Design a protein around this ligand. Sequence first.
Ligand SMILES: Nc1ccn([C@@H]2O[C@H](COP(=O)(O)OP(=O)(O)O)[C@@H](O)[C@H]2O)c(=O)n1
Ligand SMILES: Nc1ccn([C@@H]2O[C@H](COP(=O)(O)OP(=O)(O)O)[C@@H](O)[C@H]2O)c(=O)n1
Ligand code: NA
Ligand code: NA
Lengths: 137, 137
Amino acid sequence: SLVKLMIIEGEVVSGLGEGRYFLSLPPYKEIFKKILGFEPYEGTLNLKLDREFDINKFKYIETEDFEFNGKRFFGVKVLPIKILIGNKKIDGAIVVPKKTYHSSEIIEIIAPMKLREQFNLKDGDVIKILIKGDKDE
Amino acid sequence: SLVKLMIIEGEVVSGLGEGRYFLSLPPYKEIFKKILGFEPYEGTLNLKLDREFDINKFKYIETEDFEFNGKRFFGVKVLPIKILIGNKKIDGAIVVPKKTYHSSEIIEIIAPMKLREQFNLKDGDVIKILIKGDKDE
Ligand SMILES: Nc1ccn([C@@H]2O[C@H](COP(=O)(O)OP(=O)(O)O)[C@@H](O)[C@H]2O)c(=O)n1
Ligand SMILES: Nc1ccn([C@@H]2O[C@H](COP(=O)(O)OP(=O)(O)O)[C@@H](O)[C@H]2O)c(=O)n1
Ligand code: NA
Ligand code: NA
Protein backbone atom coordinates (compact mmCIF):
# COMPACT_ATOMS: atom_id res chain seq x y z
CA SER A 1 0.00 0.00 0.00
CA LEU A 2 1.01 3.65 -0.15
CA VAL A 3 0.47 6.77 2.00
CA LYS A 4 0.60 10.32 0.75
CA LEU A 5 1.55 13.20 3.05
CA MET A 6 1.66 16.94 2.41
CA ILE A 7 3.34 19.32 4.87
CA ILE A 8 2.55 23.01 4.44
CA GLU A 9 4.13 25.98 6.31
CA GLY A 10 1.70 28.62 7.54
CA GLU A 11 2.28 32.04 9.09
CA VAL A 12 0.16 32.82 12.16
CA VAL A 13 -2.24 35.68 11.40
CA SER A 14 -5.29 37.27 13.07
CA GLY A 15 -8.94 37.57 12.03
CA LEU A 16 -11.45 39.87 13.74
CA GLY A 17 -12.68 37.27 16.22
CA GLU A 18 -15.05 35.45 13.87
CA GLY A 19 -13.99 31.93 14.86
CA ARG A 20 -14.45 32.38 18.63
CA TYR A 21 -18.02 33.30 17.75
CA PHE A 22 -18.81 30.42 15.40
CA LEU A 23 -16.97 27.87 17.58
CA SER A 24 -19.05 28.93 20.57
CA LEU A 25 -22.19 27.63 18.82
CA PRO A 26 -23.15 24.22 20.27
CA PRO A 27 -24.18 22.66 16.92
CA TYR A 28 -20.70 23.36 15.50
CA LYS A 29 -19.01 22.25 18.75
CA GLU A 30 -20.96 19.00 18.86
CA ILE A 31 -20.57 18.08 15.16
CA PHE A 32 -16.82 18.80 15.23
CA LYS A 33 -16.48 16.55 18.26
CA LYS A 34 -18.39 13.74 16.48
CA ILE A 35 -16.35 13.98 13.22
CA LEU A 36 -12.94 14.60 14.69
CA GLY A 37 -13.01 12.86 18.04
CA PHE A 38 -11.86 15.94 19.99
CA GLU A 39 -13.60 18.94 21.60
CA PRO A 40 -12.23 22.05 19.85
CA TYR A 41 -10.97 25.08 21.70
CA GLU A 42 -13.52 27.84 20.98
CA GLY A 43 -11.78 29.66 18.15
CA THR A 44 -9.83 29.08 14.94
CA LEU A 45 -6.13 29.68 14.31
CA ASN A 46 -5.82 31.66 11.05
CA LEU A 47 -2.78 30.78 8.92
CA LYS A 48 -1.42 32.49 5.88
CA LEU A 49 0.02 30.09 3.29
CA ASP A 50 2.14 30.94 0.27
CA ARG A 51 -0.26 29.32 -2.25
CA GLU A 52 -4.06 29.09 -2.33
CA PHE A 53 -5.54 26.15 -0.47
CA ASP A 54 -8.27 24.11 -2.12
CA ILE A 55 -10.02 21.75 0.30
CA ASN A 56 -11.68 20.04 -2.71
CA LYS A 57 -8.39 18.34 -3.55
CA PHE A 58 -8.80 16.27 -0.32
CA LYS A 59 -11.26 13.87 1.31
CA TYR A 60 -13.10 16.33 3.56
CA ILE A 61 -16.22 15.76 5.67
CA GLU A 62 -19.17 18.15 5.09
CA THR A 63 -21.50 19.27 7.89
CA GLU A 64 -25.17 20.31 7.61
CA ASP A 65 -26.97 23.65 7.76
CA PHE A 66 -28.81 24.41 10.98
CA GLU A 67 -30.75 27.14 12.81
CA PHE A 68 -29.67 28.32 16.28
CA ASN A 69 -31.05 31.09 18.51
CA GLY A 70 -33.20 32.05 15.52
CA LYS A 71 -30.51 32.53 12.81
CA ARG A 72 -29.54 30.28 9.88
CA PHE A 73 -26.01 28.80 9.85
CA PHE A 74 -24.44 26.90 6.99
CA GLY A 75 -22.52 23.62 6.94
CA VAL A 76 -18.73 23.54 6.69
CA LYS A 77 -16.09 21.33 4.98
CA VAL A 78 -13.73 19.78 7.53
CA LEU A 79 -10.39 18.11 6.86
CA PRO A 80 -8.52 16.30 9.71
CA ILE A 81 -4.84 17.27 9.98
CA LYS A 82 -1.85 17.15 12.29
CA ILE A 83 -0.47 20.48 13.50
CA LEU A 84 3.35 20.48 13.81
CA ILE A 85 4.97 22.96 16.19
CA GLY A 86 8.64 22.20 16.81
CA ASN A 87 8.80 18.50 17.73
CA LYS A 88 5.20 18.28 19.01
CA LYS A 89 2.06 17.37 17.07
CA ILE A 90 -1.57 18.21 17.75
CA ASP A 91 -4.73 16.73 16.18
CA GLY A 92 -6.63 19.42 14.35
CA ALA A 93 -8.67 20.20 11.28
CA ILE A 94 -8.93 22.76 8.50
CA VAL A 95 -12.45 24.24 8.39
CA VAL A 96 -13.80 26.03 5.30
CA PRO A 97 -17.31 27.36 4.64
CA LYS A 98 -19.15 24.99 2.24
CA LYS A 99 -19.70 27.81 -0.27
CA THR A 100 -16.98 30.35 -1.04
CA TYR A 101 -16.54 32.73 -3.98
CA HIS A 102 -12.95 31.37 -4.39
CA SER A 103 -10.13 29.41 -2.65
CA SER A 104 -7.95 31.43 -0.26
CA GLU A 105 -4.33 31.40 0.88
CA ILE A 106 -5.72 31.95 4.38
CA ILE A 107 -6.98 28.87 6.21
CA GLU A 108 -8.61 28.41 9.61
CA ILE A 109 -7.68 25.51 11.87
CA ILE A 110 -9.31 24.04 14.95
CA ALA A 111 -7.54 22.10 17.73
CA PRO A 112 -8.30 20.85 21.24
CA MET A 113 -6.16 23.54 22.92
CA LYS A 114 -5.46 27.23 22.49
CA LEU A 115 -2.36 26.94 20.39
CA ARG A 116 -1.23 30.53 20.97
CA GLU A 117 -1.15 30.00 24.75
CA GLN A 118 0.24 26.44 24.73
CA PHE A 119 3.06 27.39 22.31
CA ASN A 120 3.42 31.17 22.80
CA LEU A 121 2.49 31.89 19.14
CA LYS A 122 2.39 35.51 17.91
CA ASP A 123 1.40 36.94 14.53
CA GLY A 124 4.29 36.13 12.15
CA ASP A 125 5.40 32.89 13.77
CA VAL A 126 5.48 29.99 11.30
CA ILE A 127 4.10 26.50 12.03
CA LYS A 128 3.27 23.48 9.86
CA ILE A 129 0.25 21.37 9.16
CA LEU A 130 0.28 17.85 7.81
CA ILE A 131 -2.39 16.35 5.61
CA LYS A 132 -2.61 12.59 4.96
CA GLY A 133 -4.19 11.29 1.75
CA ASP A 134 -6.00 13.23 -0.99
CA LYS A 135 -9.29 12.97 -2.91
CA ASP A 136 -8.09 9.86 -4.78
CA GLU A 137 -6.73 7.97 -1.74
CA SER B 1 6.11 26.44 1.12
CA LEU B 2 4.93 22.84 0.96
CA VAL B 3 6.56 19.38 0.75
CA LYS B 4 4.92 16.29 -0.66
CA LEU B 5 5.94 12.81 0.50
CA MET B 6 4.80 9.39 -0.68
CA ILE B 7 5.63 6.24 1.30
CA ILE B 8 5.15 2.94 -0.51
CA GLU B 9 5.45 -0.61 0.96
CA GLY B 10 7.38 -3.10 -1.17
CA GLU B 11 7.88 -6.84 -0.81
CA VAL B 12 11.46 -8.07 -1.31
CA VAL B 13 11.67 -10.26 -4.42
CA SER B 14 14.44 -11.77 -6.57
CA GLY B 15 15.45 -11.25 -10.21
CA LEU B 16 17.87 -13.53 -12.07
CA GLY B 17 20.97 -11.51 -11.25
CA GLU B 18 20.51 -8.81 -13.89
CA GLY B 19 21.30 -5.86 -11.62
CA ARG B 20 24.63 -7.19 -10.30
CA TYR B 21 25.64 -7.33 -13.95
CA PHE B 22 24.51 -3.86 -15.02
CA LEU B 23 25.74 -2.25 -11.76
CA SER B 24 29.18 -3.73 -12.33
CA LEU B 25 29.55 -1.58 -15.48
CA PRO B 26 31.77 1.45 -14.70
CA PRO B 27 29.74 3.94 -16.78
CA TYR B 28 26.62 3.14 -14.73
CA LYS B 29 28.60 3.11 -11.46
CA GLU B 30 30.20 6.48 -12.21
CA ILE B 31 27.03 8.25 -13.43
CA PHE B 32 25.00 7.00 -10.44
CA LYS B 33 27.69 8.32 -8.11
CA LYS B 34 27.62 11.75 -9.86
CA ILE B 35 23.78 12.05 -9.78
CA LEU B 36 23.12 10.59 -6.38
CA GLY B 37 26.21 11.40 -4.37
CA PHE B 38 26.79 7.79 -3.26
CA GLU B 39 28.62 4.77 -4.71
CA PRO B 40 25.99 2.05 -5.20
CA TYR B 41 26.43 -1.51 -4.03
CA GLU B 42 26.77 -3.59 -7.22
CA GLY B 43 23.22 -4.86 -7.60
CA THR B 44 19.59 -3.76 -7.37
CA LEU B 45 17.03 -4.71 -4.73
CA ASN B 46 13.84 -5.81 -6.55
CA LEU B 47 10.58 -4.86 -4.80
CA LYS B 48 7.07 -5.92 -5.57
CA LEU B 49 4.49 -3.16 -5.00
CA ASP B 50 0.72 -3.51 -4.90
CA ARG B 51 0.11 -0.96 -7.71
CA GLU B 52 2.08 -0.18 -10.87
CA PHE B 53 4.85 2.37 -10.45
CA ASP B 54 5.20 5.14 -13.02
CA ILE B 55 8.49 7.03 -12.71
CA ASN B 56 7.09 9.68 -15.11
CA LYS B 57 4.90 11.04 -12.32
CA PHE B 58 8.12 12.24 -10.58
CA LYS B 59 11.13 14.48 -11.23
CA TYR B 60 13.62 11.82 -12.33
CA ILE B 61 17.12 12.27 -13.78
CA GLU B 62 17.85 10.57 -17.13
CA THR B 63 21.25 9.12 -18.02
CA GLU B 64 22.80 8.72 -21.50
CA ASP B 65 23.39 5.75 -23.80
CA PHE B 66 26.95 4.47 -23.98
CA GLU B 67 29.11 1.68 -25.42
CA PHE B 68 31.27 -0.50 -23.14
CA ASN B 69 33.46 -3.52 -23.94
CA GLY B 70 31.95 -3.36 -27.43
CA LYS B 71 28.20 -3.51 -26.60
CA ARG B 72 25.56 -0.75 -26.62
CA PHE B 73 23.89 0.16 -23.31
CA PHE B 74 20.94 2.48 -22.88
CA GLY B 75 20.36 5.35 -20.45
CA VAL B 76 18.17 4.95 -17.38
CA LYS B 77 15.66 7.11 -15.43
CA VAL B 78 16.78 7.59 -11.83
CA LEU B 79 14.70 8.88 -8.91
CA PRO B 80 16.37 9.60 -5.51
CA ILE B 81 14.52 8.08 -2.54
CA LYS B 82 14.89 7.16 1.10
CA ILE B 83 14.70 3.47 1.99
CA LEU B 84 12.94 2.83 5.34
CA ILE B 85 13.72 -0.39 7.20
CA GLY B 86 12.41 -0.35 10.77
CA ASN B 87 13.65 2.93 12.29
CA LYS B 88 16.64 3.33 9.95
CA LYS B 89 16.80 5.16 6.62
CA ILE B 90 19.16 4.71 3.69
CA ASP B 91 19.72 6.98 0.67
CA GLY B 92 18.80 5.15 -2.49
CA ALA B 93 17.20 5.50 -5.89
CA ILE B 94 14.64 3.80 -8.10
CA VAL B 95 16.18 2.93 -11.48
CA VAL B 96 14.05 2.21 -14.56
CA PRO B 97 15.15 1.61 -18.16
CA LYS B 98 14.46 4.76 -20.25
CA LYS B 99 12.23 2.79 -22.64
CA THR B 100 9.78 0.16 -21.39
CA TYR B 101 6.75 -1.41 -23.05
CA HIS B 102 4.71 -0.53 -19.90
CA SER B 103 4.96 0.49 -16.19
CA SER B 104 5.53 -2.38 -13.73
CA GLU B 105 4.57 -3.17 -10.14
CA ILE B 106 8.16 -4.39 -9.76
CA ILE B 107 10.80 -1.74 -9.14
CA GLU B 108 14.58 -1.93 -8.75
CA ILE B 109 16.40 0.12 -6.14
CA ILE B 110 20.05 0.97 -5.64
CA ALA B 111 21.73 1.86 -2.31
CA PRO B 112 25.25 2.26 -0.94
CA MET B 113 25.14 -1.05 0.98
CA LYS B 114 23.88 -4.56 0.40
CA LEU B 115 20.52 -4.20 2.06
CA ARG B 116 19.90 -7.95 2.37
CA GLU B 117 23.10 -8.42 4.40
CA GLN B 118 22.87 -5.21 6.46
CA PHE B 119 19.22 -5.91 7.42
CA ASN B 120 18.89 -9.70 6.99
CA LEU B 121 16.21 -9.31 4.26
CA LYS B 122 14.71 -12.44 2.65
CA ASP B 123 12.18 -12.79 -0.18
CA GLY B 124 8.79 -11.83 1.30
CA ASP B 125 10.03 -9.31 3.84
CA VAL B 126 8.34 -5.92 3.47
CA ILE B 127 10.19 -2.57 3.56
CA LYS B 128 9.24 1.00 2.60
CA ILE B 129 10.56 3.63 0.26
CA LEU B 130 9.92 7.34 0.54
CA ILE B 131 9.70 9.72 -2.37
CA LYS B 132 9.82 13.51 -1.90
CA GLY B 133 8.15 15.80 -4.44
CA ASP B 134 6.53 14.92 -7.78
CA LYS B 135 6.69 16.13 -11.39
CA ASP B 136 4.95 19.42 -10.49
CA GLU B 137 7.04 20.25 -7.40
N1 LIG C 1 -7.15 26.20 18.60
C1 LIG C 1 -6.98 27.55 18.58
C2 LIG C 1 -7.99 28.38 18.10
C3 LIG C 1 -7.80 29.75 18.13
N2 LIG C 1 -6.63 30.24 18.61
C4 LIG C 1 -6.46 31.69 18.79
O1 LIG C 1 -7.50 31.99 19.74
C5 LIG C 1 -8.00 33.33 19.51
C6 LIG C 1 -9.49 33.34 19.27
O2 LIG C 1 -9.83 32.69 18.05
P1 LIG C 1 -10.56 33.41 16.84
O3 LIG C 1 -11.19 32.33 16.01
O4 LIG C 1 -11.54 34.44 17.42
O5 LIG C 1 -9.42 34.16 15.96
P2 LIG C 1 -9.10 35.71 15.54
O6 LIG C 1 -10.15 36.06 14.52
O7 LIG C 1 -9.13 36.40 16.88
O8 LIG C 1 -7.71 35.62 14.96
C7 LIG C 1 -7.21 33.89 18.33
O9 LIG C 1 -6.10 34.58 18.91
C8 LIG C 1 -6.73 32.62 17.63
O10 LIG C 1 -5.51 32.84 16.96
C9 LIG C 1 -5.64 29.39 19.12
O11 LIG C 1 -4.55 29.84 19.54
N3 LIG C 1 -5.82 28.05 19.06
N1 LIG D 1 21.65 -2.34 -2.62
C1 LIG D 1 21.36 -3.65 -2.83
C2 LIG D 1 21.37 -4.17 -4.12
C3 LIG D 1 21.09 -5.52 -4.30
N2 LIG D 1 20.80 -6.28 -3.21
C4 LIG D 1 20.65 -7.73 -3.36
O1 LIG D 1 21.96 -8.12 -3.85
C5 LIG D 1 21.83 -9.26 -4.72
C6 LIG D 1 22.42 -8.99 -6.09
O2 LIG D 1 21.66 -8.01 -6.79
P1 LIG D 1 20.93 -8.28 -8.17
O3 LIG D 1 20.73 -6.94 -8.83
O4 LIG D 1 21.79 -9.27 -8.98
O5 LIG D 1 19.48 -8.94 -7.84
P2 LIG D 1 18.74 -10.35 -8.17
O6 LIG D 1 18.39 -10.28 -9.63
O7 LIG D 1 19.78 -11.35 -7.73
O8 LIG D 1 17.54 -10.33 -7.26
C7 LIG D 1 20.35 -9.61 -4.77
O9 LIG D 1 20.14 -10.58 -3.74
C8 LIG D 1 19.70 -8.28 -4.38
O10 LIG D 1 18.46 -8.50 -3.75
C9 LIG D 1 20.83 -5.74 -1.92
O11 LIG D 1 20.55 -6.44 -0.92
N3 LIG D 1 21.07 -4.41 -1.76
NA1 NA E 1 -9.74 32.55 13.86
NA1 NA F 1 18.13 -6.81 -8.70
